[PDB]
Ligand binder design. Sequence first.
Ligand SMILES: Brc1c[nH]nc1-c1ccncc1
Length: 93
Amino acid sequence: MPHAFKPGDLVFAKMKGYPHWPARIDDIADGAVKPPPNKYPIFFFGTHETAFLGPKDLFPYDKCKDKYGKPNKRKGFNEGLWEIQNNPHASYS
Ligand SMILES: Brc1c[nH]nc1-c1ccncc1
């Protein structure tokens, strides 16, 4: 039964103008910028960009991969598909 989102959870994250994108709930490093209240730091695979999102835009990866996990022409998307499937918890800095 679902819990709240926690660092390390794998998701598809929805941003305006982008398809649902392979992503993870990031950790917040010591001394790093914290997200606004009720928002999570979302690390987008492939592009390696971060955005702050609420749960309305976060879809669990295992439940939605058959819907959202197909190749896409957008820059970084297919690289992101490889990352979320093959090394989702690695450091991509
Ligand atoms: Br959606 C997506 C995939 N990679 N990066 C993004 C993104 C776009 C804009 N602001 C933050 C993150």
